Symmetry: C5
Subunit: 384 residues, 5 copies
């Protein structure tokens, strides 16, 4: 006349101790099977070398104290028991560095032969060793080691619920619209021993993830291209205009402030720097070379009033690779000498300015070729 569930709960949970490992022969370990499904990757901190994920975790073990015959209890083959009323193994990850706030599941399933099932979502704060050598295109290899913190392998052994193929090829619920992309989850069993007669069992899950580089394209490639374009645009100013130096120094200031602003989002580890810093400093070196060429050309064509005539070797190479009446007379001769001195100085300045113009055009063509070579090399290395 009982509801056939109160009867079973009173038959099971009475005279039951939740501190004893549920075995009738203490020489047998409780094999705890484990299954893990990745759901989301909340935050990957490259500075502190931590990893915040969120998984759906579930275990199975045999409780030799929760067993009954269904025909006695109205063919009841399973029921739900509160989690704080039975023995639960202490399986937790070795690579913890904090505690994740996870919802509390208060019930567990129990079958008529002792098979307990415990579904529980977990938020993991794992200390992973991150390598950012190829920053925009890197494949991180983090590990999760499920082990019993106190019991040896003669008490709790850890197996896998599903086959390793199904665990590796499972992306059914992963939030894929984020920054990271899940490649696989590779499980592996290992008997880790600290001493003799003290061997622990553990199950390592290798979470292999890959970053999406288009998150940083608009933030890394656009300003450099824009600055190189405005540089090759400003390279067409006349060298004697007195504004090319200001243009180049303002451009270098802008590139410097952009570099020191974007260096914050760029991660950094104490072991090494990403390979993009080399390309950034190569671009800034190209800008500095452009500035130095501008300064040299300005130093050439400047009218300093100390200019001597251009040497003949340089001329060849560059410009082929490109009485009262007597008193009146002497006064007029002095005036003509003054005017001729002025005209000769102007002609020397003109010759120097033409030489400078030719050299500037040559160096501009060389710089353009070098920039195009560097750009096509970068494009090929991106496209391979």
């Amino acid at each position: 006349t009982q509801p056939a569930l109160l009867r079973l709960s009173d038959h099971l949970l009475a005279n039951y101790k939740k501190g004893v490992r549920p075995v009738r022969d203490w020489r047998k370990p409780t094999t705890v099977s484990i299954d893990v499904i990745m759901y989301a990757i909340l935050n990957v901190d490259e500075k502190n070398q931590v990893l915040t994920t969120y998984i759906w975790y579930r275990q199975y073990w045999t409780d030799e104290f929760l067993q009954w015959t269904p025909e006695d209890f109205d063919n009841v083959t399973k029921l739900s028991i509160p989690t704080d009323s039975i023995w639960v193994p202490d399986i937790l990850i070795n690579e913890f560095v904090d505690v994740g706030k996870s919802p509390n599941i208060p019930y567990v399933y129990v079958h008529h032969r002792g098979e307990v099932q415990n579904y529980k979502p977990l938020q993991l704060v794992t200390a992973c060793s991150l390598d950012i050598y190829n920053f925009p295109f890197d494949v991180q290899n983090c590990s999760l080691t499920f082990t019993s913190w106190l019991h040896t392998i003669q008490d709790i052994n850890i197996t896998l619920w599903r086959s390793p193929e199904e665990v590796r090829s499972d992306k059914s619920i992963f939030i894929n619209q984020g920054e990271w992309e899940l490649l696989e989850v590779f499980p592996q069993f290992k008997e880790f021993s600290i001493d003799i007669s003290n061997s622990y069992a553990e199950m390592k899950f290798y979470v292999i993830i890959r970053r999406r580089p288009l998150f940083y394209a608009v933030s890394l490639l656009l300003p450099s291209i824009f600055l190189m374009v405005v540089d090759i645009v400003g390279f067409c100013l006349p060298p004697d205009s007195g504004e090319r130096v200001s243009f180049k120094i303002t451009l270098l200031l802008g590139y410097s402030v952009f570099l020191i602003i974007v260096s914050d989002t760029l991660p950094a580890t104490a072991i090494g720097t990403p390979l993009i810093g080399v390309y950034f400093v190569v671009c800034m070196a190209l800008l500095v070379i452009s500035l130095a060429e501008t300064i040299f050309i300005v130093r050439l064509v400047h009218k300093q009033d100390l200019q001597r005539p251009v040497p003949d070797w340089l001329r060849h190479l560059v410009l082929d690779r490109i009485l009262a009446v007597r008193g009146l007379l002497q006064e007029l001769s002095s005036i003509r000498h003054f005017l001729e001195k002025r005209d000769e100085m102007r002609e020397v300045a003109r010759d120097w300015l033409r030489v400078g113009y030719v050299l500037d055009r040559l160096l501009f063509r060389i710089y353009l070729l070098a920039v195009l070579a560097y750009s096509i090399t970068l494009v090929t290395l991106w496209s391979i």
Copy 2:
């Protein structure tokens, strides 16, 4: 002589087990009805793809162990029972990524036929997939899936307390002065099965929200308009003044620093970039074209002392589309030749400067027409 409430509490909560599903026949599921009301949208994080809301949640189910006759207990038809004294279903959202700090409601209502009522406010930290293609005007479509985490559909089935129309058209308490605007909450029932004989029941609520674009108008449209205005103002400087290049390069530096400052508040997802980046780079391309035109006009009108007379075709097109006495004599002739050379060089420079002025006016008119076309196109696309 008892207070008629102590009697009922002792009659109900004695011999009561809070771990057993309250059914007299285990072949019947406990239908849990659900009602949800949105109250506030605390934070929408487009970077980590999370959503923090705050709802008012309430459920109803039938407890076949809490039943009495009112006439026996002084016509008491309902009372309040502590929540930790009865069976509560484990209904929680599938899309959790954290735990929200919510107040604890310690009591529940119970009627004389078993109908339990459980009001409880919840703070949800939900992993939603956000699409920001149309950033200032986007309609996000997030989902909340209420399901039983352990019980199958033969134990706990989920229904709706109100009709779907009332759930869709309910905005009675929503905090509307924020950044997001609630459009509707659309419920839908689905029997989600992982395997055969293992089918779970769930209730999906589609929270459809829309961002208010005036939050970002004063921060996105004002600086671009101001910079375009000062650009068309500075376009009136004389090209031979030697300050137009400095003006344009300072303006481009200011636009660049504004761009890299405002790019932080602009969100970004690893799948795509918003459509406002295209308009921003089009504006910066217009600025770069203005700079290039200024540089070209400066290169034309510069007095380089190497200037040859302007060709006749260009002239036509542009400027129509717009003895002691003999010794004294030869000395005076040399002086006159010097002066005539100077005057001829000045005249050539004047002709080139006039050609440059005409071309500058033409290109300024063209640039103004292009800017007005782009502005009216943007205004129409905003106003449609």
Copy 3:
């Protein structure tokens, strides 16, 4: 021979149920009186529309199960009982969006007729609708609604312990050295009904606060005044010096970077923008007008070698509102003609420069008058 307190505790807390509403007749509600005192305003977030306060809260109700005669228990008229041993009503605020960490008070006072007293400090995280139209001088009007989350008005009714005058005029412990100033706390009772036969009681407290504007004076008024001063200082540079344009563009760049830096501390709501943005854009428009006037005056006085003589109407208005011997002869005449051409061009340039100087002085006086008018209008609007 007992300590006369153990006796009373055993007489009261034995056969006592902490889940039953303490009434002998279930047709009577437990009138819970409420008193609230503001202590501090921790943080007002205008972006997320939340409000973090800290109050001293206390309630009073009648427990008909905790009653005794003092003469029996050695004239004991009151004692302290742990809070987890009696019935406590579930009074909490409707406008919660989080949980505040508040100290736990473990004891309550009980008198010999059932009057229980429960002092408890609370930290509130309340969702308030903030209006920042007059940002530096605004009077926020936030609300706190104390209501029973589950019980109707036939079970728990809410009254006020003190008179509304004393609750409105109480600032005894408020931390007044902060940014916000408390004006009053106005209570109001309302019977809020969702349906028929389901009416809830609630008590609304309107916390009316006012911001102190001197917190932002040194951060908002000082840079604008400094920039206007340096602008009217730089307005005295000669227009033909070739540095006035650089001065004005550097000043505009500085004002722009200051604007985009201070726009972060300036709050913003999706419904509207504060009225200070209008004054800021008016100041930046004044700066842009100064830049345009400088550009115009520079365009006037520039020596372009294309300058024609100033028209007579403009002149009037502005400048009144302010043989071998024959061969020698012809050679000397040609020289004199060259010199006369140069002198005539210089004279035309001088006339244009004088006209430009006069117009610059006139426009500078006009701009100074306009700036003084705008400043005195702002001062009057602040002082009223």
Copy 4:
């Protein structure tokens, strides 16, 4: 035959009620002695007016229900009892605004006459009123008020364990390498009464701390000195070089960006601003005066072709405080007149430039004297 500790624990904790104030005569209060030792000052927030400290707190009271004779229990004079098994007073600070995460001490000492001892470390989040008028050198005066939150003075009275001298002169464990320096902790007892017959006891501890100014020397004094030095360096540029104005405006831009960058680390309260802002605006006013002097000197020495001869009073003061033959003849006379006009204009320009040079040297000496006076005044005010 018992371990002589199980016996005593069963003799004490049996028939013991942890909710009753441990007195045999309810007309006697439980005098709780208090001792406090500062350990660290974690964070002082001048914006929100909070203070986060960490103290070592300990109390002593007499429990008249925990008493025994040592000779009966094998000369046991003291033992440890779990804290959740006895009565603990509710002593907490009045100035709380949050809850501090502190370790939990599970045991307390009890002597054979009832003296209980309760050591416990506490993290305090206290609302302190901060005065930052003298920001780099300020002595904050914060208060901690230990009082019983519910019990009046007839139930719990608060005394001091050590003498006030030892509490004032105790710096044994204070972390001294931080930013703040502890001066003293001054205790004071006060009987605070809200009404008649309702008087509470409290113990106020005045934590008097002092900031170390060398934390901000390298961040406040270095850039101002550097900018003043580069200003007095750039003051030596020739006034007619056309670069002094650019130098001064770039320097003012740099000082402005430094000011608006360092104004963030500078705290600010709604009641007043620190006294360092006055010195900062005095320095910026000196820079603006230098800019105005440069502009004036530039306006003096500029060659505008409108220059009239320098007036004689200014000259005195400044420069003492520092036929075919007839046709040929008339043509030569016209040429000589042109040349003489040019030479006269050049001579007038030279005179004006010399006057400007003299005035510039005089004003530079005056500015240097003023800067040295201001610097020595600041040094003396720092050194007193």
Copy 5:
């Protein structure tokens, strides 16, 4: 017929008190052995002087109430007991300033002679005194003091489980890819006494860590080298070009903004500043000296029309260490005098410009030598 584990649990945990120190003779202390292994260093905050680590902690003590004979209980020599069922000592660190979220280990091992084992991971928030005098290369010396917070040395004494050599030379699990490198963990025992007859036992662990300097190389050495390079590049501009001053002032502005940007990542303590600030201000002083030299050379070579001939001593040193006919006649003489005056002024300007060029080359060579000396000194101090 019992499972031989339920029997042992009922034999042990029945009649067991978890509040009594497990000794049969109260005159014997419970020697608690301790072992500590560092696992990760999460965050070192130099501003607030805190240290966040994560260790693997384990203790051992003898429980004289948990003892049995294996042959009686089926040769069971050990089992797991819940932690909340036995007596656990209150060993915690003295240098706490917060509470670290650590996983909860619910079981402990117990042998058949009372040896209990308690493994537990801990997250420590320790107040450490940090010295950053040699910021990029510093060896921090932090301390962890494990002591019993309440029990004296006659109740709980603390020993070491492993030998001090094994504790010092253990780096088996340390996360080494981070910013800090673990050198050793040196334990030391000390009997700390506050009074007479009140002596406590404690165990100090000196965690000695060292920072990796390559984390800050790319952020500290690169911009300074780049700016020095562009400075020595710009040092080649002609001094009379009128752009060298603009170049130098723009470079100084860039260096200043870089300095004030990187000064944030540079830590700072109230006791002293790191030694890198001296080198940074030496570099900025070199830049200021370059600016002053540029200003001096510009002041020398400027054509001011007030230039007097260069003195002979300076010349030697520098330039060796490097009637109608009569009317026509007088008119021609006046013209020649004008031209000769102009030519003489030009010649004086040329002489001054040559002197300035020579001095500029000399000072540039001196500055280059000084820069190379400073760079090689820095390189040697880094390489030693």
